[PDB]
Design a protein around this ligand. Structure first.
Ligand code: HEM
Ligand code: HEM
Ligand code: HEM
Ligand code: HEM
Ligand SMILES: [Mg+2]
Ligand SMILES: [Mg+2]
Ligand SMILES: [Mg+2]
Ligand SMILES: [O]
Ligand SMILES: [O]
Ligand SMILES: [O]
Ligand SMILES: [O]
Ligand SMILES: [O]
Ligand SMILES: [O]
Lengths: 306, 306, 304, 307, 306, 306
């Protein structure tokens, strides 16, 4: 059986998201780090157990894949597709490696990020570094409970992990990242009732709006997708608030894991391009994407045997 | 008896330090915020009891004091004194207001900082914003336990709180801040034994080096000071690690509270200018001050009664 | 097939809600059943992961016929009243059971509020009990309660419907009885006399050896061996409850099993006695004031 | 410095409020129990240290005081004063003894309530019993954070504990209890902003409404009282949610401690009878008081030195 | 004004009791260690703040006091008084220094005991070392709750701390230690009701037996003492269970703190020699004392100034 | 189908290791206790759910197996093999039964140990009893993190549990125990860099030394073993510190679970007898084995069905 990376792990109160590009001739240094990254995770995390809950998920971009490895490519791997909607745009930004670092404490994230970047100095250029913090009541930067409808157990495994459709990369997953900045002044001008119509859930109680009152351009309505079979298409999201009060930056770092990028890309199409019944997702009237990248997160044993 | 701010409260795992200057015409907006800051601390923190441990200490600079208030000035309040040592410099940087925000979680610090800065928008200019995190084993950025010789109980109250020497300001304190960036590459080039001789304590066990072994130019030696009366002069320090792995920023945010700035200033003179037996504090060969500001943190009732 | 949380452990808080379905309330009920997993997530996610909020939903025999056409679960019937020589196990009305558990009563109450809010005008409440953990997993008699519950594979085998009734695999049967205790009479016994009623040591919870365990002890009468000589097991989530002012010191009994026959055999031995035992001596200190039987379907049965 | 009961202690996650009346001839049994109540609290609580946080505050009503004790009365002790407003009524209901029991767990509350009621069986009649629970982030059944502006440290000591004004009773306090039931159907028909105008604080973030927007008939406006010298008059509230989903009971158990009942009573007069600017507290349009009792909670040493 | 050691602090889940004798010529080494013990306590304890709750109380015996110090002695400091009852004996055993180490975790106790014994190697001989542990709900090896009637708050300060009756030694206290082994076989031969008549409290619920059923020879009856003026004479007990299952050793380590040894010794006389109404404390029919030592625990500042 | 004992369970903060020999005629009493040990575990542990995490793993020695049972032996069961190296010796010491008792608290361990030994009194003779405790951030007495490279999940199950190679004993495991005492004086004389060369990892950060600097006689180098097929051969180690400060006993209690003893024995051979490039494991220059025993820990249902 192939060992997945910790893609199925739950939300934690802290995260570091590190996106880098591989400099010309940095390939060899990168391959050596990838073969050690699970051992670095154990080195930093084991002594802080059991409360630490440290994990690192490592992702590799479409272009970087061709630079690093000969042989088969994962079937779903391609650069992030820019979406030019009538009003809102999903931008594509450079990204060769993702490190999705989670723990109960920011210091354990930082210590692992320090060892990884120590090994990669002179081989990579940092593109994005975000320090995420969840609110103590599981709320995001808009004041809503975040993660409620994430799949669990066998449903999560089936939605997130590559299987027989691409057997050489079984136990892998696809990660889409987008850094969003919010217009908090505009958001806080809405009544609570208006905010609930944007999201599609009650703010205090987190109960879903019933189908007769849920607007067709609510976040929950547009990111609800049924397959040909009639079955719900699901992703696993580990979204984190981040910000700087001095710079008035109040953000959500979106990360969504799926067995194929087509599920996440369908949701993004419905959000940015809309449908017959909805011009666009009302959350984008308060949220601007400033990054967008797609990564393949291989099985742990693929990184180890390299 | 006057009610002090939470200057005596213990170290926490998260902090936000905010330093701002007051723009032209900003004084009325600032006075309104000062009269409300304790009530905002309760609004953000109460619902997160008892695990939240949210506090805010508010400080006011020498020039800002004269802009905001008529009548008496605290006896020790003056702008930070630059020290131009033969090798190392303690710089002065602008700062009218300090908010020293502590909690068990960064998101609680961030929520109070958001409310404070929301009320000050258009009246202030941000000078500095640092998000602090302690390592899970009470270690600083240099790998040493930080806080060990802080005073506690009655000795802390005597060391930190203004009393009858300045009775109109009793229950106040003086805060000096300095942001330090470390040369971690040079520090990690030392053996553990050489680092212990820089600090003056054992790294793993935190046991102080004996007087026979402890170098005259160690941090513990130079920051150990006796008054004319033979008594130890003590300050309370809430130093926090901070940084950015992508930018290679690895820092210690120094904050020290004391009943009179003369004690903190004497320690800084010994570190930066040295003594007969030591050229300077050896910690400064690995640590560059990039900010320096002095604040008076009044009694809580002083701020309430505006 | 995915079961409801019938295999989940004891928690420190619980709400037990039993209602009857009023005439014409069927459609409101079916809509709520299709939504109960989503309500559970909605309330529970506000306290992940320590909250441990779950709701197990059960349906009575008469309600089943009012709600669904086609196949019945093989073991579903109304609770069988037992009229013993001394003690009686009463059958009381109940169409729906909500077995709500969490680490905190707030999560239980918030979920109960949303469920009952959705069913207002469609159901009549019959029983509501707010259970709480009592010291080191003790009951109102001062004994540790749950010790011999099966775990892991033995729990799955004992609790979940399998191939014997394949349309309903991953279901279970719940029996509930609210008991009120005579604490005055109980505290009149020596600790040694109480140990002989239960069949375990009071402070240390060690089982009495077979040579000393009375045949009419609770542990002896509820020990049943199946055709192959293996133990027939149930999973019990008993919770203390009460009201000091009204002198109500209670045990809310709930037992899950793959077939009701196992639980019913245990109840027959307790209430009717055997050749060796007049009745379960625990009943000399405990009166059953409710009795109901429910089928707790697979989670997938409810969503569909 | 005489030793107070645990009146200054913080909110906990569980509580039992027990109100009883003393039957004729029950006085000797009650005095005996009062002399033992601190020892019973230690007997239950000590084995759950350090996390248990079990405490019991024992209060005695005006008429019970006269039956139990032959000497001096606390200066402020009198029966609860019924308030007959143009719209709303604050009823006075019987209660001789209050047990305010708090812990981090209901089991410790229940076990201590069991031991106390076991000692008083046949001497007292139960009037009210409420099992309170913390609801999410210190919320009440109206969805608002409750307790935010409670005084702390020295301010709490000054606001709550009897001192030199009544020296024989120094370290005592005065507790007012009211059981409120809420009309949740009517409450949930308001917009969140209309709820915020009833309470005077933001619902989700618990920030006080600015003075320009805070209505005069908001809860926070009517329960804000200044003394003649301009300083705030404060009380310490340990309010707890309770209820029963089947019976549609969604309750707030109000308890307020103060150094003199005059402060709590001035707040109640403003709520129920209103001011020049406000007819009544808008919170009462959604809240009905069904009990009302006043108790003196003596210093701990006063109870210990009985017979 | 004088700062007591942590004699008033509550029970913890772990303790180490270390009793040593001072070798001939060990006096100087011992004096240097005593002046450093508070600094060693902070060095170990600070890196587990705030849940560690590490503390060390240092006690000095009567014969050791006269070897270490000159001038005035604490008024009540004498060797433990052997009690030769008709049936039961309280033995006196050697001991010059007591280290009473408590924390929430054994590791912090063990690390501090290691640093102390490292400084004293070749100057002292170990007489007794006991690792204590919390047993369920504050129970002892007899199955009863132990510590229930300890004084708290002001009553504890008044019972425990030397004051104006011996002003030079204000802030000190007197510790009596006795290691007890229990005859568990004999004890378990009693019914629970017989055990309750030995102790004087209910076993499961820890409710005191009423005055009309409490035997005169029960432990609670003989250890209840009133002064000539009617007030209760109280001690503070920090008893801890210990044992070794292989050796069939089930113990109680008794430690009682009091402002004068006369209170503790009056209790011991009643237990071992009895009263007019009681031959001896029935708890002694199931408990054997194998050590007995008395120590003065000076104010913290007395040790620091050496 | 067969239910293993709790061999795969994680490290806990407390342990008791009990090794006994079966006295002549004690066989019938032992068989009765083996059939009840799981019942005793529930009796003590249930009341402390869910935080207690009490488990007992019961092991039987080679000589004991033939005294207790008729019919098939586990294929790998033999007496511990004494290793007589040029410098260091791995002694074989008597042991018929192992009880490996773990929990989050020592009380639960002690209570279960008391019930087991109460049933075995007069049938067994105790050989060793060790009370283990967690030391800071999962450290051993040498000050290094211990457990870091233990296998987890599927890799742990594959490394530890007997499968189809010995189908009658599927779900069993083999436990090797060795009690080590450390020369802390000699160890603490080494610089941290020289200690790192003994172990093969960085002391404070627990990062593995790179292959270019790791000495061939380091602990990590000698306990790293590859099968003929190139895979890593793994064991599960649940090592616990123990000690007594007055007796200068600073111990590591070694316990290693494996699907076959040949893996553990290959590691011991390399440590004690060395390789072409290493005389012996340098850790043995600071560590003396004083016990050595091998046990088969059967499937839980094997014990239940006696
Ligand atoms: C500013 C960015 C975002 C914010 C603040 C945000 C917030 C939320 C919230 C509050 C919910 C409801 C509770 C939950 O189930 O987590 C939700 C649901 C969801 N979001 Fe987002 N979201 C954002 C971006 C995205 C993006 C970019 C996607 C997909 C590409 C996405 C996919 C989903 C999905 C699939 C659900 C679950 C819908 C359901 O089936 O109920 N979100 N989000
Ligand atoms: C530049 C970055 C700094 C770092 C990384 C640092 C770190 C440390 C460490 C590790 C200790 C030993 C443990 C303890 O906290 O007692 C210490 C002690 C101390 N530091 Fe700093 N420190 C810094 C700057 C300062 C400054 C600027 C001052 C004063 C103006 C200061 C004053 C002290 C004092 C008074 C002590 C206690 C010494 C004693 O009496 O034992 N430190 N510091
Ligand atoms: C007054 C109501 C009850 C009380 C207070 C009570 C209490 C207990 C206690 C203290 C135990 C021993 C520890 C353990 O849980 O294994 C026990 C065991 C048990 N009880 Fe009950 N019980 C009650 C009613 C029932 C009922 C109504 C049934 C069955 C229909 C039942 C079935 C069992 C079973 C099967 C065991 C396990 C026996 C074994 O195999 O060891 N109980 N109960
Ligand atoms: C249905 C009954 C009640 C409910 C739901 C309720 C709820 C609240 C809420 C939500 C607050 C705002 C947060 C805070 O606690 O500071 C508050 C404040 C307060 N309440 Fe109540 N309350 C009730 C009855 C009472 C009564 C009867 C009194 C006095 C007799 C009282 C006195 C106060 C006071 C003094 C404040 C603080 C006002 C300030 O200075 O800001 N409340 N209450
Ligand atoms: Mg009978
Ligand atoms: Mg206020
Ligand atoms: Mg014996
Ligand atoms: O999301
Ligand atoms: O510092
Ligand atoms: O049960
Ligand atoms: O309130
Ligand atoms: O004691
Ligand atoms: O190891």
């Amino acid at each position: 059986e192939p060992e997945p990376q910790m893609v199925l792990s739950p939300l934690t109160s802290a995260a570091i998201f590190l996106v880098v590009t591989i400099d010309s001739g940095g390939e060899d240094t990168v391959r050596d780090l990838l073969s050690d990254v699970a051992s670095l995770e154990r080195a930093v995390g084991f002594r802080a157990q059991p409360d630490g809950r440290l994990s690192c998920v490592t992702g590799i971009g479409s272009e970087a894949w061709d630079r690093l490895f000969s042989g088969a490519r994962p079937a779903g791997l391609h650069p992030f597709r820019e979406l030019d909607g009538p009003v809102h745009r999903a931008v594509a930004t450079p990204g060769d490696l993702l490190f999705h670092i989670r723990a109960s404490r920011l210091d354990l994230c930082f210590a692992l990020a320090t060892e990884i970047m120590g090994r990669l100095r002179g081989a990579v250029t940092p593109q994005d570094e975000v320090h995420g913090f969840k609110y103590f009541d599981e709320r995001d930067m808009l004041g809503f409970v975040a993660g409620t409808e994430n799949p669990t157990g066998a449903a999560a495994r089936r939605a997130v992990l590559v299987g027989a459709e691409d057997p050489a990369f079984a136990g892998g997953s696809y990660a889409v990242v987008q850094k969003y900045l919010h217009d908090i002044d505009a958001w806080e001008g809405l009544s609570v009732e208006a905010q609930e119509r944007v999201i599609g859930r009650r703010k205090m109680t987190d109960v879903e709006l019933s189908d007769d009152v849920k607007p067709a351009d609510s976040h929950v309505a547009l990111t609800s997708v049924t397959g040909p079979d009639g079955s719900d298409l699901e992703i696993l999201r580990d979204n984190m608030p981040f910000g700087s009060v001095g710079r008035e930056e109040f953000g959500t770092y979106f990360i969504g894991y799926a067995r194929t990028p087509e599920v996440t890309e369908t949701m993004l199409e419905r959000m940015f391009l809309g449908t017959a019944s909805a011009p666009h997702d009302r959350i984008l009237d308060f949220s601007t994407a400033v990054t967008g990248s797609l990564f393949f997160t291989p099985a742990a044993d693929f990184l180890e045997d390299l």
